[PDB]
Amino acid sequence: DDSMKSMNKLDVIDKQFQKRINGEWVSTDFKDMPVNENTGEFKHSDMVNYANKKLAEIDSMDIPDGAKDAMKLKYLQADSKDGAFRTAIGTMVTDAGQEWSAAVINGKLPERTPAMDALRRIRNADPQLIAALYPDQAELFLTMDMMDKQGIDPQVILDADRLTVKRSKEQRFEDDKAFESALNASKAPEIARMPASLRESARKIYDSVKYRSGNESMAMEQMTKFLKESTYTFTGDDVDGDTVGVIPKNMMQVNSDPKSWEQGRDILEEARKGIIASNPWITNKQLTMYSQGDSIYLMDTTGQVRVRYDKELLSKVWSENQKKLEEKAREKALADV
Amino acid sequence: INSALNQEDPRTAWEMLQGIKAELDKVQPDEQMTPQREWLISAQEQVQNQMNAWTKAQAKALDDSMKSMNKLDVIDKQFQKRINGEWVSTDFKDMPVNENTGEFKHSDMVNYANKKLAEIDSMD
């Protein structure tokens, strides 16, 4: 009885979930469609079982790695932080984390590293997103990206992370004050206006890299290169050219891939420009673009003019616009034939 | 069948699906409404729709290629003007659409710098 009930409710869940992936506003929380008569009740067990079985199913598909990982990500969005898929990928992350920990204790790194390898496969594809959802193990992401993208050996990190002294509660106060001075006394646009989410991560990477070899430049070096890999700085049209904002490269993403972030920057700039010319006197120096938890917000200094710009609407407007512009493209492209 | 659907390019999707049909033909030799055949032919409509999308996407890529080439050469000429002459204002706002170049996304100038730098690298 359980096998039939699970199969039926499982396919129902998967269909109503594909609806959420393609469409919107489907409410996959717990309460689904149980009117199948055969499916009957939904236990909470299915959605966890659904995520697990579907993730393994994707693993067993025939496609190349690119489609597999794009699909894992296009499933990682979106459920309402239940989390079913979010918790599946999350326990994968903590597995990689504990595994690299055990490598640290062990002194060398064990071969074949299954969890680390799977994490490398998934995260290579959208560095910012995996990190964003789990704002806890940024340390592991930093170390892995040191391990593979950059050329350093996964042996020279092992000692330095095994050789560390315990910060012993004393030199830290000095360390908190430290995060605060190189931050304030930095005057590099991105670090100073630190956009917020990224500030919460930022604190980590700095403290991590410092415990490695000679630091406090290497530390700022890595932190700045990371913040460069993760937030556009929107520069002003004026020839100074003073920065007007730091809006995070993850949240300007139209649709689901980062090529899209790029395409979206081309929406936000058109928006910031129309404002400056439209309301004459709002010289670029005056305008600021300020984010929040999840919103790209845009203000001239006098509080009067202030346009919001949000993941949902920016995304979906760009989606329809690209859609029927691509329609026009097909039309006159096939007009040749 | 889901793998046949989820291919990168819908061409390989369609030919792999057609091969799977030609094979199913052996084991299930009666064309009819075998539940597996129902699954298989929603798959055919599915790959047809995916091919529709792929045609549209390749056409948009064609349009972007022409727009990028044209606006790219326009940018480069108006930039050589700044290099030789003065006071040309290469900021964002450039020599606009003649009839057919494009609205000048911000993407071009970054693309322009990158492609031109590699181009210089490839010179003789």
């Binding site: 929406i267 928006a271 129309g274 609407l313 512009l325 | 609205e103």
Partner: peptide, 13 residues
Amino acid sequence: AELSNSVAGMAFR
């Protein structure tokens, strides 16, 4: 404008 693509359009809407 209202019913246009062209970048402007996306920002406006």
